[PDB]
Amino acid sequence: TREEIADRMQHNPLVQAYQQEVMHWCKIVYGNSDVLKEKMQEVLQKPSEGEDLSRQVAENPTSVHKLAGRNLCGLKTNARRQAEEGFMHLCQALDGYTSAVTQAQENIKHVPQAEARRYG
16 A cells, blocks of 8 residues: 555656656756665655655755865855755755655545546
8 A cells, every 4th residue: 555655656746747847957056966865765655755856965065966066165156156046945845845745645535535646
């Protein structure tokens, strides 16, 4: 069932939309859109780890990947300036993703008949 729930949540519109959003901002902040792909899949299997993933990126972003571009003694290259600017959006997108996953798991457990009727 838990594996089935994650199967349903794969197609959830909000889950998909935020997932794509996270990848966009990973590309900007980290220079690589795939950096959080695996962990986002892992959160589908265990939504309770979503909060952890969110905090790790927000409070220790370089534990995940190096920041795009370079900061040379205070001179930020364009890619780095865009990374810094995009960091807030990456955290929002990720908060959005993990909350949507948690919110989806709950409403599937609350009213499965309604999820059966989604067909999308």
